Structure 1
Amino acid sequence: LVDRDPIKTSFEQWAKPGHFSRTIAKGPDTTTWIWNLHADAHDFDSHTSDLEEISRKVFSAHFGQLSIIFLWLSGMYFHGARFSNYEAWLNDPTHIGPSAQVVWPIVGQEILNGDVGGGFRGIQITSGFFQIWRASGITSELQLYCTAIGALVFAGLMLFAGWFHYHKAAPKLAWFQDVESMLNHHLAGLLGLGSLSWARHQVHVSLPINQFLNAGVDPKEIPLPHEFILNRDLLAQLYPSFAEGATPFFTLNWSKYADFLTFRGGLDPLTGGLWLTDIAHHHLAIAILFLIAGHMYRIKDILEAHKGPFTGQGHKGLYEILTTSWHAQLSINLAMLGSLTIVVAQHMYSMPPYPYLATDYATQLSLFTHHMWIGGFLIVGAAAHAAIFMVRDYDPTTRYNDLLDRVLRHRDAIISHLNWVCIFLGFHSFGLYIHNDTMSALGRPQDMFSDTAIQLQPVFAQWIQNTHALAPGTTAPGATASTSLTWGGGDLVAVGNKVALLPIPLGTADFLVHHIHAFTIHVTVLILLKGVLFARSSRLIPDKANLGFRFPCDGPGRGGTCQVSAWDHVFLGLFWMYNSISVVIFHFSWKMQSDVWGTINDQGVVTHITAGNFAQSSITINGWLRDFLWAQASQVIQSYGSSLSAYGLFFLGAHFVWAFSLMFLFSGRGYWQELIESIVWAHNKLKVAPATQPRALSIVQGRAVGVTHYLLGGIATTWAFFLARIIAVG
């Protein structure tokens, strides 16, 4: 390509058919290249055979995410502001049931807008702003309206840094191809200087402006816009102005104190969102580390070190090419970023970190399943992109004889095991349930697997739960309750509208879901593991790195020779994970409502959204639609003519879109060709078709329009199924 250059046009390329592999989009017309162009639009086997740029693009086309997450948030802060309900909800929590969005009464619309709290028509929320927002050491609607434009500021600017890259004549190699410092910085002072900084604006301002909110008032009968400077006088109620101490150290006297923190654990009676008196200390006690920690270092050295006998000789030298990969140092990350998201999903529901959550049921489970699909949707990826490594990234083979060349050495092996693992599971991990049916429908309970028939006896208790809620008696200092109230030992009194967390008991019907997870988590990974491992060569095809990591299927021979590849192992690996997460969700809420969520009154006689129906009745896998799907969902199929209605009214579409995927999943290809011409014929008679040769779907595009649909179908189905059984009773 010209047009023409090198050097010697500014005149930009708008006009002249094509670009992207060289007997390119050819003069001669076609359609396939219009899904080409969008797909693989980002890729790197083309653009140039030379690293250089690519990192100079990804550090820019990156940017436009932050900026975006930044245009987003703004319409959420704005939204969570003038489309109010926040002002109204906060003087009045336990009571309200929040909104931010509202229609405009065009056509049918309005049904969707149904009285939500501080006196107005709207559609609800299961996205816990209104609750980060508890923070506001200040309060005010127009104020969020500054935090809002403060958002659009970071954006335009944190979006003109993206002009101020690639398009501007760019940095180069050394800049990233000296890695030497990167984490040094990152973790030290941002990971640090945020958490740190967050400390300073987490007791300064917030703690006090909810220390005396957890009582009454109406805001501006509290927390001015400046009030919190030098005036270290209201900081007087929430500890000393250090009195006689000077910059910690010890020649200090406490005859009666010990700074803010004074460590909690449990839950505010009046706002059980976990205590804040702590929340500063923990973030402070973070940062320090990061503050000390981001001070390594300059790199091989540490990895060029510990080897052994069978261990990893190539451990030593574990990648020069880890300054020369991406597709590698992205895949690693996704496993972590991803696997480090759904660890949120627990510490959240068994330890709320915001005021008013749990009581708020629906506004932190939405969460625990949204955060849950990322700690999964980012993991199969975290494999895909390793397959993208394993196939291609490096120039030649300069990488040699090491940890990997090792793992591969065995490979019909690491995956030889893992397999049997799964059929051991599955048999012990699902037909287990099927016993029950076949023998409870035969009907002889003597011999089921009930929490009571097969020998276990009115106790689960003695394991580690019961040595967690009881541990404030070790090296442990203490502080009433535990760490997470859901643990075996002691305490009850949690909240005065509805409930929050309490013990959460186990045994079987907790024993075996917990095991289906195993088998589910395991056969997921089998297919990804073997998939990324056998990326490039095999004894079904060895001539098998020769195009890319996709390729439809090699060809009718060898018997099958179809699925193979690794786009496709990252195609049938999604297919499982949709279950992996989709059944983990199914788990939590049936627990968390069967027990936990429920409610106090006199003598606090607890009354769960369901008197533990779980008991003897999830163990039957029909009980999973006797007690679940057919029981709850009665709220989705009753939901017409209401306010939420948009869920029942989705629940048919998307419970349709899924049942459209199979068409894309289950079908041939020269088929819709053979068909597309009958069409093309009738077209030509009137004189109406040929130009831009209309073509069927690109074997693997077809699979691309399976899967993606099967998910946005099979998923939102419950996104509806859910929001419709926590809004309204529960």
Structure 2
Amino acid sequence: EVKILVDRDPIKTSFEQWAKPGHFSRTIAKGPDTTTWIWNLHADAHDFDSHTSDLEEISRKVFSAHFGQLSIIFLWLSGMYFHGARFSNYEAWLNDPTHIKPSAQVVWPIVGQEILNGDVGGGFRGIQITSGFFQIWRASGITSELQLYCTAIGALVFAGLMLFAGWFHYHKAAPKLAWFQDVESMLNHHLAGLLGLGSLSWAGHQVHVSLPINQFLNAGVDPKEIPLPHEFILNRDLLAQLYPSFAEGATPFFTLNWSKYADFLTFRGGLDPLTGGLWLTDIAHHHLAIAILFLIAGHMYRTNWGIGHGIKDILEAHKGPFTGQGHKGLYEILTTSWHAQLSINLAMLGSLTIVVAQHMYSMPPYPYLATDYATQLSLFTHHMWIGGFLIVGAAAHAAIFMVRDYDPTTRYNDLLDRVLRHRDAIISHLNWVCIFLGFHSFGLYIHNDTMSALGRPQDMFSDTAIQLQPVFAQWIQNTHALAPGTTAPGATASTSLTWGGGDLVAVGGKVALLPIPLGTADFLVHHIHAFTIHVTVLILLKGVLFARSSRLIPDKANLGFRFPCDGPGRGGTCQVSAWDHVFLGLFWMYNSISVVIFHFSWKMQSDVWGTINDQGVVTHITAGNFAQSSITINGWLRDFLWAQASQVIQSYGSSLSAYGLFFLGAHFVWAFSLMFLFSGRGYWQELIESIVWAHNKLKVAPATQPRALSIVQGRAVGVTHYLLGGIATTWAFFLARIIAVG
């Protein structure tokens, strides 16, 4: 019987706990004897499992926490809209999107930083933004700064509401555990109410506000001269002038004469030639269909009426000869353990962010986006990074479940057990396939470097020597290019210009998109991707599968999820914990994503982006050198890194100088991590002994005894500074490069 369950006033609201650091932990609440205390206070702050054993209290904590997060995000959006209204060149940009650089940040004039306010156009001086907000705002039909202001106020209000909701649902009316456990209902409401009504109502805004205003903008009429959005709702005559379907109102909808609505609900595909973005009509139709799909999907699970599936039933129905009991027991696991859920959701959300990156490069959804190379590069890189991080997190919390929540005596599952019983085979096979992949991908590169160095280019792996064609990908390309004529008749063009066949979409003299050629170089990089991903998976999966025990450490589970080791014995057992596997997996994720974004950058600058001359002459940014240059490590070293770092290294004395500063700073932080990664806390402790002596000599030794960081924190600081450094380096490199030569 699914219903609203809530406890009234579980926790009194008082600043008393604010004045007592570490209140959540009986150990930390006692106070500091050494400095280590401090770090612990922050490390275990959000580890609610180590706070209480009660699943209910934890669930409440996470719920209000989520409200806090949403509040923060609303405040963030509020900031973006407000800065877009008060400190930007957005209207000017609307007047001329093809020759004005998007800027929504200005700096104050002190210590010379005024130079950062550069000539972005529109009679405005500031920092060029690469978030892509301007194209969103144009797509939403926003024309004035006033509307941006109003959206900012709305977002601020929503921030207040989310914060209050957090306080309310923690201190005043806190849901019961059964409420959180109503997964059938939660799934129904999230499928139908969130996504369904979300894309439905959004389709509403698109059909009533986006389409008309954008039609006007594309027509060329001055934005101020364009009718306000509410008028298109009040006066249906305007929409009728733009799309005659509205003359018949909602009649063809109910009478099933949907063909009449082909004016604003299309299925053309490809890109709009005068904007370089997907057709907004296609987008509106897309959101309508999606809305229907999710709406019907949200009626799958049984709640307070007979109809509907039971999750446990569907799970217990799937069991084979190879797997025995199958998915039985998983419902209980996934309705009592937050870490399992977090694992699944992190893996899938990360993967989703990755697919978002790819789909947004290859099918530009916003007007004047494809030709804003800075924005595209930025979006791709950003979402790729977010994805990778979320995935590593999925590994972490999978392992955390494996150590803290797994209990085969009370919550047994056959699949998990069987996985555990042949983990050696799984990990060994992953190992082998990783070595094979490494050899047969990187080894090709080294082979090429050697042959090239020895004066034997005819012995290389390339398109002009020993060819390794991506036949399968080429076939998929051709198939997807010929699809509109055969297997998708209702579609006018392809879903993306990047497919093997097609024309070329250009906007304002710049290339928006064109068919992307795939050769030996692409085979090579793709197999590098497969390799790096496989290694990352090797590390993480090994980490979670051996989190509880191994032949080396039979009782590793009792040591916890996060611990440095089990001593120098057994030959040495450093980094045996699953946490340390998350730690190594982070480095490998960094590696993989780095080579991925380099792949994207070089390929785009070489074979896609660039200017287009009259009669159809396309001049790319790096003139198609990829196919010949990316086949050796030296090519990446010289033609990519060395050649393209030019913009960042000579950005001094201009508006892009901050990128030079960040280039150097990031290199510095990266190197700085190596001190932590390469060393150990014993040395630091003894050094600290000497320094402490010096402080005692002058009566200035603190009561909170100065301690070297723990082994684990040394590792965490190490990997954190390593990632921050490397990623920020590629950040500065990318942005300076693409902003200067774009």
Q: TM-score normalised to the size of structure 2?
A: 0.94
After TM superposition, the structure 1 stretch with the greater mean CA deviation from structure 2, 542-551 or 509-518, is 542-551
Which residue, out of 515, 533, 558, partners 1:546? 558
- Out of 653, 669, 672, the residue aligned to residue 684 of structure 2 is 672
Q: 1:43: how far off? A: 1.2
Shift, 1:223, TM fit: 2.2
Judged with a 3 Å threshold, the aligned counterparts in structure 2 of structure 1 residues 62 and 119 are, in CA distance, closer, same or farther, namely same
Q: Kindly indicate whether the alpha-carbon contact (under 8 Å) linking 2:240 and 2:247 is maintained by their aligned counterparts in 1.
A: no
Alpha-carbon distance, 1:540 to partner: 0.6
Q: Deviations over 1:341-382 (max 9, x none)?
A: 110111111100000012111111100000100110000100
Note if 1:602 corresponds to 2:614.
yes
Whether the 8 Å CA contact 1:536–1:545 is kept in 2: the answer is: yes
* One of 518, 521, 534 as aligned partner of 1:509: 521
Higher deviation after alignment, 253-262 or 411-420: 253-262
Displacement of 1:247 in angstroms is 4.4
- 1:321: Cα distance to partner? 2.0
Distance 1:597 1:5, change over 3 A: closer
Measured in 2, the distance between the counterparts of 1:426 and 1:475 equals 38
Normalised TM-score (structure 1): 0.95
Shift of 1:84: 2.5
Note the C-alpha offset of 1:448: 0.9
Distance in 1, Cα, partners of 2:399 & 2:40? 21
Deviations along 1:681-720, one digit per CA (max 9) or x if unpaired, are 0100111114111100011000011000000001100100
CA offset at residue 5 of structure 1?
15
Distance 2:485 2:559 in 1: 62
Q: CA RMSD in A?
A: 3.0
1:405 is displaced (CA, Å) by 1.0
Distance 1:2 1:439, change over 3 A: closer
Q: d(CA) in 2 for partners of 1:380 and 1:257?
A: 46
Relative distance call for 1:7 and 1:614 in structure 2 (3 A) is closer
Q: Deviations over 1:172-216 (max 9, x none)?
A: 121113333111011112200011000111010110101121132
Contact 1:636 1:648 in 2 (8 A): yes
Q: Deviations over 1:477-496 (max 9, x none)?
A: 24443110011112125323
CA contact (8 A) 1:273 1:353 kept: yes
Q: Is the 8 A contact 2:120 2:128 kept in 1?
A: yes
Describe the shift of the 1:7–1:300 C-alpha distance in structure 2 as closer, same or farther (beyond 3 A).
closer
2:280 and 2:259 mapped to 1: Cα distance?
24
Q: 1:500 to 1:35 in 2, by over 3 A?
A: same
Q: Is the 8 A contact 1:3 1:13 kept in 2?
A: no
**Equivalent pair of 2:142/2:148 in contact (CA under 8 Å):** no
* Shift of residue 401, structure 1, vs aligned partner: 5.0
Q: Which moved more, 1:203-212 or 1:238-247?
A: 238-247
How far apart are 1:257 and its partner, in Å? 7.3
Change (3 A) 1:452 1:5: closer
Instruction: Report if aligned partners of 2:243, 2:264 keep a CA contact under 8 Å in 1.
Output: yes
Question: C-alpha separation between the residues in 2 aligned to 1:429 and 1:632?
Answer: 25
**Residue 461 in 1 paired to residue 473 in 2?**
yes
**1:132/1:354 contact within 8 Å kept:** yes
Q: 1:164 aligns with which of 162, 168, 178?
A: 168
Whether the 8 Å CA contact 1:341–1:372 is kept in 2: the answer is yes
Look up the SS of the partner of 2:696 in the other structure.
Answer: helix
Q: 1:694 to 1:242 in 2, by over 3 A?
A: closer
Cα pair 1:460 1:507 within 8 Å, conserved: no
Q: 1:33 to 1:312 in 2, by over 3 A?
A: farther
3-state SS, counterpart of residue 517 of structure 1: helix
- Matched residues in 2 for 1:626 and 1:607: separation? 21
Q: Mind listing any 5+ residue stretches in structure 1 that lack a counterpart? A: none
SS at match of 2:410: coil
Residue of structure 1 equivalent to 2:59 = 55
Question: CA distance change for structure 1 residues 291 and 107 in 2, over 3 Å: closer, same or farther?
Answer: same
Partner of 1:338: 350
C-alpha separation in 1, matches of 2:471 and 2:218: 38
Change (3 A) 1:227 1:338: same
Superposed CA deviations along residues 558-601 of structure 1, whole A, max 9, x for unmatched, are 00111111100000000100011011001011000111101111
Which whole-Å deviations, capped at 9, do the CAs of 1:68-117 have from their partners, x for residues lacking one?
11110111100111213001100111010111001010112111111111
Q: Pick from 10, 24, 30: which aligns with 1:26?
A: 30
**Are the counterparts in 2 of residues 127 and 366 from structure 1 also a CA contact under 8 Å?**
yes
CA contact (8 A) 1:433 1:621 kept: yes
CA shift, 1:12, in A, is 3.3
Task: Judge conservation of contact 1:324–1:394 (CA < 8 Å) in 2.
Answer: no
Q: 2:453 aligns with which of 406, 431, 441?
A: 441
**3-state SS in 1 of match to 2:135:** coil
**Structure 1 pair 546–282 and aligned structure 2 pair: CA distance change class (3 A):** same
Bigger shift: residues 223-232 or 606-615: 223-232
- Report deviation, 1:312: 4.7
Aligned pair count reads 730
Contact residue 265 and residue 481 of structure 1 kept, 8 A: yes
Question: After the TM superposition, which of the residue ranges 576-585 and 486-495 deviates more from structure 2?
Answer: 486-495
8 A contact 2:9–2:174 mirrored in 1: no
Aligned equivalents of 1:3, 1:62: Cα separation in 2 = 19
Distance, in Å, in 2 between the alignment partners of 1:668 and 1:3 is 49
Alignment of 1:388-467 (within 5 A): 388-393=400-405, 397-400=409-412, 402-455=414-467, 462-467=474-479
| Residues 255, 698 of structure 1: alpha-carbon distance in 2 compared, 3 angstrom cutoff | closer
Q: In the alignment, which of 581, 590, 610 is matched to residue 578 of structure 1?
A: 590
Write the distance in 1 (CA, Å) between the matches of 2:731 and 2:685: 36
Q: Deviations over 1:481-524 (max 9, x none)?
A: 31100111121253232111101101201111000001100011
Mapped to 2, the partners of 1:37 and 1:4 lie a distance apart of 30
Between 1:486-495 and 1:343-352, the stretch displaced more is 486-495
Q: 1:593 to 1:401 in 2, by over 3 A?
A: closer
Distance in 1, matches of 2:21 and 2:219, equals: 70
Q: Displacement, 1:441?
A: 0.4
1:444–1:196 Cα change, 3 Å: same
The alpha-carbon distance between structure 1 residues 254 and 664, as it changes in their structure 2 partners (threshold 3 A), is closer
For residues 359 and 710 of structure 2, what CA distance do their matches in structure 1 show?
44
CA distances 1:260-305 after superposition (whole Å, capped 9, x unpaired): 2122212222211111121110000001011111012223110110
Paired with 1:33 and 1:10, the residues of 2 have a C-alpha distance of 24
Q: In percent, how many aligned pairs have the same letter?
A: 100
Q: Given the alignment, which residue of 15, 18, 22 partners 1:14? A: 18
Would you tell me which structure has more helix in proportion to its own residues?
2
Aligned pair in 2 of structure 1 residues 138, 427: CA closer, same or farther (>3 Å)?
closer
CA distance in 1, matches of 2:487, 2:408: 55
1:525 and 2:529 aligned? no
**Quick check: 8-17 or 682-691, which moved more?**
8-17
Unaligned ranges ≥5, structure 2: 303-310
Whether contact under 8 Å (2:602, 2:640) holds in the other structure is yes
Q: Distance in 2 between matches of 1:465 and 1:342?
A: 20
**Is the Cα–Cα contact under 8 Å of residues 209 and 229 in structure 2 kept in the other structure?**
no
The answer on whether the counterparts of 1:537 and 1:543 sit within 8 Å (CA) in structure 2 is: yes
Q: 2:403 touches 2:560 (CA, 8 Å); kept in 1?
A: yes
What is the distance in 2 between the residues matched to 1:394 and 1:161?
33
Where 1:273 maps in the other structure, the secondary structure is coil
Residues 43 and 156 of structure 1: CA distance in aligned 2, closer, same or farther (over 3 Å): same
**Residues 115 and 654 in structure 2, CA contact (< 8 A), matched pair in contact too:** yes
Task: Map 1:250-289; keep pairs closer than 5 Å.
Answer: 258-289=262-293
Provide Cα deviations, 1:503-551, integer angstroms capped at 9, x if missing partner: 1101201111000001100011101001001111111101212232011
> Is contact 1:496–1:600 with CA below 8 Å preserved after alignment?
no
Relative to structure 1, the CA distance from residue 390 to residue 70 in structure 2 (aligned partners, 3 Å threshold; closer, same or farther) is same
Q: Is the 8 A contact 2:21 2:41 kept in 1?
A: no
Stretch of structure 1 that moved more, 458-467 or 192-201: 458-467
| Mapped contact 2:28–2:37 kept (Cα < 8 A) | no
Contact 1:504 1:596 in 2 (8 A): yes
Aligned to 1:4: 8
Secondary structure at the aligned position of 1:190 is classed as: helix
Q: Is contact 1:184-1:296 (8 Å) kept?
A: yes
User: Following TM superposition, by how much is the alpha carbon of 1:383 offset from its aligned partner in structure 2, in angstroms?
Assistant: 0.6
Q: Find the counterpart in structure 2 of residue 103 from structure 1.
A: 107
Change (3 A) 1:353 1:179: same
Aligned residue for 2:124?
120
Provide the rounded CA distance (Å) in 1 between the counterparts of 2:6 and 2:347: 42
